RNA sequence: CCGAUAACGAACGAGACUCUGGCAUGCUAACUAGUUACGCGACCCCCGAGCGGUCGGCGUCCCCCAACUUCUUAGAGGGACAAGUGGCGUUCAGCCACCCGAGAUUGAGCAAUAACAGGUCUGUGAUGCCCUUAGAUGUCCGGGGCUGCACGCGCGCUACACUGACUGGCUCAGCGUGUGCCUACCCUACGCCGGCAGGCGCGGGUAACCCGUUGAACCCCAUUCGUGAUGGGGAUCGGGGAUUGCAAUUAUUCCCCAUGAACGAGGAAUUCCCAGUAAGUGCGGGUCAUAAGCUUGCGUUGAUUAAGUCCCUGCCCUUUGUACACACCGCC
């Protein structure tokens, strides 16, 4: 999961963006669920402009 | 002699009640909703209507005809819109049909007695939030 | 402080009191005359307009909730 | 000149002591034909002082659930009371009210949070603004207490309250509480 | 010295016209006037025996101000307030047939006719009296 | 004029199986009769053509008995068929209106009729429980403790 | 044997007190003597210039 | 109270004062129009906040040596 | 944020932003909004005015056969930025008072890292694992149940009365909805019958075109009530009638007539709140075949105290102590 996310996050910055953040959560490793957040660049969350500044999936 | 194009329609609004005053050259006459001012339901607040004419006297109103229509708000909001309309139409009539020095010596007495006559009240309402029944009241909470 | 037991109908023992000095004070009101004569108060209103018809009592207000009488012009 | 309710002009009223002079608004500038104005007096601290006292009594007279926005009923009650007190005494209703305000405001109180003496511990005197505010509140409450379950009406109750207060006879509710507050405060000096 | 109904007090105007209809006995009155209420919400029958002569007087004044009124317009004008006991109060309309028979009765005095569209309005015949009565009560009130 | 009390003013009257106060107004004084309500009282006084403004105690004896038989017999005196109490009788089908203790024992007769047929409403009545389907979770506790 | 009620005019607002802020502490100067001044605790809103009643001569004066 | 400016508005104010000094004065109304053409301010409520501070620093700049 | 500063240069959050409200007689506009003027009228004045007054009566996009946006609506824009004066301040950041100003703090929406064994597998053709799978935990139908009552708690509605109830008269709102792919079910003017719920015939509206100028409530103006558990309050219960549906009993709801229960302002405690605020007071939408005491919003009337504090309950930064780290509901 981490190795794949590194290639994805690298490719997004390769194509050209101000920042990117990926969060993968669930039944990773053992039974207890955990979340991994690879975040880089700039990433705002508050206000009106986040509506048209982010691509969320 | 019978000159046309002497009419100013200056409004006054208070608590959603928009009031239109029609000021015209002619005999001294005051009428709102096709009714005389003294013939109106809130006799408790009749002096609010009589307030501007009591401050300025009927001598200035002699050459002025007033016809007011109001289509909004509540009872006393309609009244406060009416009295604002009467004064605001009059000062504008003196502002563009005689010298505005006369407009000044009629504005000073009104503005020193009550600012609401020539300044509208900006406060309207507030939205009710889903934490309580009112705009700021919150629903009563319990712990046990 | 149990009951007022006010008299709904005039008796002569107080009717003469009504006719002598009830129109003698400025604040003659239906309520004041009700507790002064131990009369009901509906009777107080009804009889007060009787003295109004006799013209010895002067009115000022005539309100549906607060009607105010007074004595004649003395002096 | 102003003829509040068509009579009872404010030119012939006075305050007997200079402590309350700045905050009583029966002045000729603060004279109003009618005691009703949505003038945004309470937008700031000390900005309610210039509001006319008659209007302050009007606002204060509505309480206890059934009377919270009803100002038309309040003005008609106060106006009928003013004609009543002018009738019963023969002088200016505003002059009777001003005498009542002076005579009803307690000159001292007491407040503490720890182990109080009797009700509070330390006696602290009041400001002229609290003198006025406690006076109006006391007069309004005295009227409501009297006419709860009897045949008397509110215009009468406010009338006798002002009459007993403006003179001082130990029968008005306002001065009865003024006696208690001053006695306990002296006990808590 | 012109007189309009809008120039006089409406409460005293309807009082005058109530007696005017009372003396002119050309007004049809049903047999159940003494029994039923004026509205579904009103708890008690009206105190006045000539309530029909006041309702008919009032609606004539209403038709002066704006025509085209029908049964729905009347029952919305005369709608009151049903306290419903322990339930919260709700606004309730008046009686349909009471207002319907009043408006039907005004053709018996020939002062209300149906418009080209829905609803009905005053005749010029009735409008003549509605101002004449305004003149007499205005003078009596003034003097 | 609000004249003085008449000599033949009965401070309490005696109608059917009850006594009314003559000090209060006649319109609301005959509502003290068990079975006579507010609206029924104000219409039989209109039919009897009595002066409403008077009190109950000054009614003449012939006025009282005339009103009594008006309220006793509703059908033959223009009282509406929809104005009664025992309309469309369970027992004998007739449109009657009862205004005395006979209302109580008629109500008892209907009540014991439901219990004799052991209907659901009757059984709940026999148990002292509610019948109008209302909840018993949190109310009605004053009649129990 | 007794002292009559006097009045004093405030000169400045020093600071709140009472461990709730429900009282203010203000320096006043006597109206019987301009050179006589004390500091007193008074409840309610107080500003400069205003004059307040005084039922007793010296009660409390503490530096906060 | 509660009107303290931000590093965003202040930094732009220092930038434009020492780059366009000759084109600025002591009028809020004039300078807010001056900032329109040299600076691309996306908010109407922000462009008068910059200019309001610009006149503030220009009152001081006529008396003392500001760090800019 | 200014400042110093072994830190420099940044980033998110705060701010900033969007929406809403407050002024724009400045611009564009309008038969799905009107307003002024003119002409027909309708009525009153008439002694006599005569441009006398009123009309939500008709007209002047019934296309050449009046204009305008002030009120209405919605776009482009403007407008307030601590701008100006004084005082305090390192005179920096900034703070207070005042003039002019519609506005000198309008309300929200969004909202950081990190975490909770907080809630949802009963929102899903989200889902792992386990269970069941024809005598089924699938699935359909009939009935009952979810309502059931010696009691305790919470969210609320109605009250306790005259600062009121009833009766009649006068008479002012803004949110917003309205006829359906499945899926049948809209909002309603007008007239007539009935006392009422309702019923019938007729229109309009897929909507600034019609309901609707939303004739709301509160409130105001007069009558009665008269301090009584009274005409306050209407709980419980009987009888009768209608509406929705296949079905109303365990009363769906609504209407009328019947009895009129406690309740006379509420002990220990405690909730919410600083201006269009609370409270009063109704009106929309959601739920709906039938429906609101709930909830979500709107409107009307409209205050008192306060421009402070750490006292209680807590929160943030720094120092401090710790035998705590499942973190004081700790450990012992
Ligand atoms: Mg933000
Ligand atoms: Mg009765």
Nearest residue of G to residue D22, measured between CA atoms: G50
Q: Which residues are CB-neighbours of A47 under 8 A, at least 6 positions away? A: none
Q: Which residues are CB-neighbours of D95 under 8 A, at least 6 positions away? A: D12, D13, D14
Q: What is the distance between the alpha carbons of residues D105 and G54, in angstroms, rounded to a whole number?
A: 13
Q: Is D94 exposed, middle or buried (0-12, 13-18, 19+ CB in 10 A)?
A: buried
> B80, B74 in Cβ contact below 8 A?
no
Q: Is B111 exposed, middle or buried (0-12, 13-18, 19+ CB in 10 A)?
A: middle
Fold of H2-62: Diphtheria Toxin Repressor; domain 2 (1.10.60)
Cβ contact, residue pair D33, B51, below 8 Å: yes
Which residue, counting CA atoms, is nearest to the C1' of nucleotide I227?
Answer: D150
> E56, E87 in Cβ contact below 8 A?
no
Q: What is the distance between the alpha carbons of residues A41 and F133, in angstroms, rounded to a whole number?
A: 67
Pairing of strands E112-114, E120-122: antiparallel
Beta bridge partners of D118: none
Resolution (angstroms) stands at 2.8
Residue range of the domain that includes G44: 1-64
Q: What is the distance between the alpha carbons of residues G7 and C32, in angstroms, rounded to a whole number?
A: 42
Nearest to B64 by CA among B100, B99, B102, B24: B24
Chain D contact for B121, CB < 8 A?
A: yes
Q: Is D126 exposed, middle or buried (0-12, 13-18, 19+ CB in 10 A)?
A: buried
Q: Which residues are CB-neighbours of D25 under 8 A, at least 6 positions away? A: D49, D50, D51, D52, D53, D56
Chain B contact for D168, CB < 8 A?
A: no
**What's chain C's Rg over C-alpha atoms?**
12
Beta bridge partners of B36: B31
Q: What is the distance between the alpha carbons of residues C74 and D3, in angstroms, rounded to a whole number?
A: 26
Place of tokens 């007189």: E3
> D157, D168 in Cβ contact below 8 A?
no
Nearest to E98 by CA among E117, E116, E85, E80: E80
Q: List bases in chain I with any atom under 7 Å of a protein Cβ.
A: 1-3, 11-18, 21-25, 35-37, 42-47, 49-57, 70-72, 78-84, 91-96, 102-103, 105-115, 117, 147-159, 161-174, 188-199, 211-213, 215-231, 233-241, 249-252, 254-260, 262, 264-265, 271-283, 292-311
**Domain coordinates in residue numbering, chain D:** 1-189
Within 10 Å of residue G14's Cβ, how many Cβ atoms? 15
Q: Is H9 exposed, middle or buried (0-12, 13-18, 19+ CB in 10 A)?
A: middle
Q: Which nucleotide is nearest to E86 (CA to C1')?
A: I158
Cβ contacts from B onto E, under 8 A: 10
Q: What is the distance between the alpha carbons of residues D113 and D181, in angstroms, rounded to a whole number?
A: 17
> A49, A40 in Cβ contact below 8 A?
no
Q: Which nucleotide is nearest to D113 (CA to C1')?
A: I311
Q: What is the distance between the alpha carbons of residues E51 and E78, in angstroms, rounded to a whole number?
A: 13
| Of the partner residues G20, G52, G55, the one whose CB lies closest to the CB of residue D128 | G52
Q: Stated in angstroms, how far is E44 CA from I194 C1'?
A: 20
> B89, B9 in Cβ contact below 8 A?
yes
Positive or negative, the CA dihedral C38, C40, C43, C47 is positive
CA atoms within 13 A of residue H21's CA, in its CB half-sphere: 10
Q: Which residues are CB-neighbours of B133 under 8 A, at least 6 positions away? A: B139
**DSSP one-letter string for E30-42:** -TTTTTS-SBSS-
Nearest residue of D to residue B115, measured between CA atoms: D39
Nearest residue of E to residue B42, measured between CA atoms: E9
> How many domains, in total, are found in chain C?
1
**DSSP one-letter string for F24-68:** SBHHHHGGGSTT--HHHHHHHHHHHT--TTSBSTT--HHHHHHHH
Q: F49 alpha carbon to ligand 2 midpoint, in Å?
A: 18
- Region of residue E85 (left: phi > 0; alpha: psi -120 to 50; beta: else): left
Q: Which residues are CB-neighbours of D67 under 8 A, at least 6 positions away? A: D61, D73, D74
Taking ligand 2, which is a single-atom ion, which protein residues have CB atoms under 5 Å away?
A: F 28, 31
Q: Which residues are CB-neighbours of C3 under 8 A, at least 6 positions away? A: none
Q: What is the distance between the alpha carbons of residues D52 and G29, in angstroms, rounded to a whole number?
A: 29
Chain D contact for B55, CB < 8 A?
A: no
Cα H19 versus chain centre, distance: 11
- DSSP H helix total and E strand total for chain E: 5, 2
**Domain coordinates in residue numbering, chain E:** 1-143
Chain G contact for D38, CB < 8 A?
A: no
Q: What is the 3-state secondary structure (H, E, C) of chain B?
A: CCCCCCEEEEEEEECCEEEEEEEEECCCEEEECCEECCCCCCHHHHHHHHHHHHHHCCCHHHHEEEEEEECCCCHHHHHHHHHHHHHHHHHHHHHHHCCHHHHHHHHHHHHHHCHHHCCCCCCCCCCCCCCCCCCCCCCCCCCC
The 3-state DSSP class for residue E124 equals helix
B/e letters for C7-36, b = 16+ CB within 10 Å, e = fewer, are bbbbeeebbeebeeebbebbbbbbbbbbeb
For residue E136, what is the DSSP state?
Answer: H
Check which CATH number belongs to the domain holding C47 and give it.
1.10.10.10
């Amino acid at each position: 999961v981490r190795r794949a996310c590194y290639g994805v996050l690298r490719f997004i910055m390769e194509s050209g963006a101000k920042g990117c953040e990926v969060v993968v959560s669930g039944k990773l490793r053992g039974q207890r669920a955990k979340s991994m957040k690879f975040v880089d660049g700039l990433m705002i969350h508050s206000g009106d402009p986040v509506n048209y500044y982010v691509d969320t999936a | 002699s019978k000159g046309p194009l002497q009419s100013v329609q200056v409004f006054g609004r208070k608590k959603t009640a928009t009031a239109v005053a029609h000021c015209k050259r002619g005999n001294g006459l005051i009428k709102v909703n096709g009714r005389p001012l003294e013939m109106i339901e809130p006799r408790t607040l009749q002096y609010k209507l009589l307030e501007p004419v009591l401050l300025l006297g009927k001598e200035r109103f002699a050459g002025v005809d007033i016809r007011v229509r109001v289509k909004g708000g509540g009872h006393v909001a309609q009244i406060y819109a009416i009295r604002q309309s009467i004064s605001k139409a009059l000062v504008a009539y003196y502002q563009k049909y005689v010298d505005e020095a006369s407009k000044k010596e009629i504005k000073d007495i009104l503005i020193q007695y009550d600012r609401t006559l020539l300044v509208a009240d900006p406060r309207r309402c507030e939205s009710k939030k889903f934490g309580g029944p009112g705009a700021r009241a919150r629903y009563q909470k319990s712990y046990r | 402080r149990d009951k007022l037991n006010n008299l709904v109908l005039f008796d002569k023992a107080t009717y003469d009191k009504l006719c002598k000095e009830v129109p003698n004070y400025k604040l003659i009101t239906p309520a004041v005359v009700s507790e002064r004569l131990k009369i009901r108060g509906s009777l107080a209103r009804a009889a007060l307009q009787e003295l109004l018809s006799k013209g010895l009592i002067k009115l000022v207000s005539k309100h549906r909730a607060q009607v105010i009488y007074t004595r004649n012009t003395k002096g | 000149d102003i003829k509040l309710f068509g009579k009872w002009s404010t030119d012939d009223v006075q305050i007997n002591d200079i402590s309350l002079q700045d905050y009583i608004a029966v002045k000729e500038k603060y004279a109003k034909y009618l005691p009703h104005s949505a003038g945004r007096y309470a937008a700031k601290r000390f900005r309610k002082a210039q509001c006319p006292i008659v209007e302050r009594l009007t606002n204060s007279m509505m309480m206890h659930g059934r009377n919270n926005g009803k100002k038309l009923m309040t003005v008609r009650i106060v106006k009928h009371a003013f004609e009543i007190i002018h009738l019963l005494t023969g002088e200016n209703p505003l002059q009777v009210l001003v005498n009542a305000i002076i005579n009803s405001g307690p000159r001292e109180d007491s407040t503490r949070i720890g182990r109080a003496g009797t009700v509070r511990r330390q006696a602290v005197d009041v400001s002229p603004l609290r003198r006025v505010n406690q006076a109006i509140w006391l007069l309004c409450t005295g009227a409501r207490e009297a006419a709860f379950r009897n045949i008397k009406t509110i215009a009468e109750c406010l009338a006798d309250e002002l009459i007993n207060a403006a003179k001082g006879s130990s029968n008005s509710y306002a001065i009865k509480k003024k006696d208690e507050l001053e006695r306990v405060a002296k006990s808590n000096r | 010295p012109g007189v309009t109904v809008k120039d006089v007090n409406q409460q005293e105007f309807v009082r005058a016209l109530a007696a005017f209809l009372k003396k002119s006995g050309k007004l049809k009155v049903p047999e159940w006037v003494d029994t039923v209420k004026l509205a579904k919400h009103k708890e008690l029958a009206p105190y006045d025996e000539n309530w029909f002569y006041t309702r008919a007087a009032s609606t004539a004044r209403h038709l002066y101000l704006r025509g085209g009124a029908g049964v729905g317009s009347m029952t919305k004008i005369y709608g009151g307030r049903q306290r419903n006991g322990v339930m919260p109060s709700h606004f309730s309309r008046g009686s349909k047939s009471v207002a319907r028979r009043v408006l039907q009765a005004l053709e018996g005095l020939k002062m209300v006719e149906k418009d080209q569209d829905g609803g009905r309005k005053l005749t010029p015949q009735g409008q003549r009296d509605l101002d004449r009565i305004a003149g007499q009560v205005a003078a009596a009130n003034k003097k | 004029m609000s004249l003085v009390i008449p000599e033949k003013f009965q401070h309490i009257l005696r109608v059917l199986n009850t006594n009314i106060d003559g000090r209060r107004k006649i319109a609301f004084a005959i509502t003290a009769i068990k079975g006579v309500g507010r609206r029924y009282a104000h219409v039989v006084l209109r039919k009897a053509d009595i002066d409403l403004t008077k009190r109950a105690g000054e009614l003449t004896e012939d006025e009282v008995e005339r009103v009594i038989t008006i309220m006793q017999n509703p059908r033959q005196y223009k009282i509406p068929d929809w104005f009664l109490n025992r309309q469309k009788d369970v027992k004998d089908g007739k449109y009657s209106q009862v205004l005395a203790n006979g209302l109580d024992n008629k109500l008892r007769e209907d009540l014991e009729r439901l219990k004799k047929i052991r209907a659901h409403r009757g059984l709940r009545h026999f148990w002292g429980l509610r019948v109008r389907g209302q909840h018993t979770k949190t109310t009605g506790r004053r009649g129990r403790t | 044997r007794v002292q009559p009620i006097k009045l004093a005019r405030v000169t400045k607002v020093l600071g709140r007190t009472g461990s709730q802020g429900q009282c203010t502490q203000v320096r006043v100067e006597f109206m019987d003597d301009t050179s006589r001044s004390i500091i007193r605790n008074v409840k309610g809103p107080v500003r400069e210039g205003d004059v307040l009643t005084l039922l007793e001569s010296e009660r409390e004066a503490r530096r906060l | 109270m509660g009107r303290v400016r931000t590093k965003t508005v202040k930094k732009a104010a220092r930038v434009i004062i020492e780059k366009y000094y000759t084109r600025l004065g002591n009028d809020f109304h004039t300078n807010k129009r001056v900032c329109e053409e040299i600076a691309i301010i996306p908010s109407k409520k922000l462009r008068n906040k910059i200019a309001g501070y610009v006149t503030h620093l220009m009152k001081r700049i006529q008396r003392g040596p500001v760090r800019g």
